Design a protein around this ligand. Structure first.
Ligand code: BNM
Length: 125
């Protein structure tokens, strides 16, 4: 397929954890970003067949999206907040990598990344 399987949202080999910061990442950070007007391209894995981006996964080797992040948070997949934050950063950087400066999709990611940074500036103790 043009599409690889989506990133795992569970892994029985990997230990689970719940922290105040991870709870906040789901309840506040993810769920607020999700409602932003520019969130829609990032709410699910890129479907290269649907979107006619046959080279997407030829270029992007560590795909990530907020649908996956949401499911990971719901499943207590992450060890800590930093691990989850890394997934958001991978999502943004993928967008900058696959596209180019000034593209509409990049303007969208830029705005979401700013809002994301505002929200993770302070996490609960
Ligand atoms: O996701 C959707 N559409 C969609 C997503 C992308 C995209 C997500 S991550 C990335 O790098 N690109 C891109 C497109 S596009 O080819 O049609 N370009 C558009 C997107 C915004 C500005 C130009 C579409 C719908 C939710 C499933």
């Amino acid at each position: 397929s043009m599409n690889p399987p989506p990133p795992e949202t569970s892994n029985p080999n990997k230990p689970k954890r719940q922290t105040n910061q991870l709870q906040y990442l789901l309840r506040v950070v993810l769920k607020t970003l999700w409602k932003h007007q520019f969130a829609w391209p990032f709410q699910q894995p890129v479907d290269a067949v649907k979107l006619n981006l046959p080279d997407y996964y030829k270029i992007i080797k560590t795909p990530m999206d907020m649908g996956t992040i949401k499911k990971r948070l719901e499943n207590n997949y992450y060890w800590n907040a930093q691990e989850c934050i890394q997934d958001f950063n991978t999502m943004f950087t993928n967008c900058y990598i696959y596209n180019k400066p000034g593209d509409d999709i990049v303007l969208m990611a830029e705005a979401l990344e700013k809002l994301f940074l505002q929200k993770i500036n302070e996490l609960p103790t």
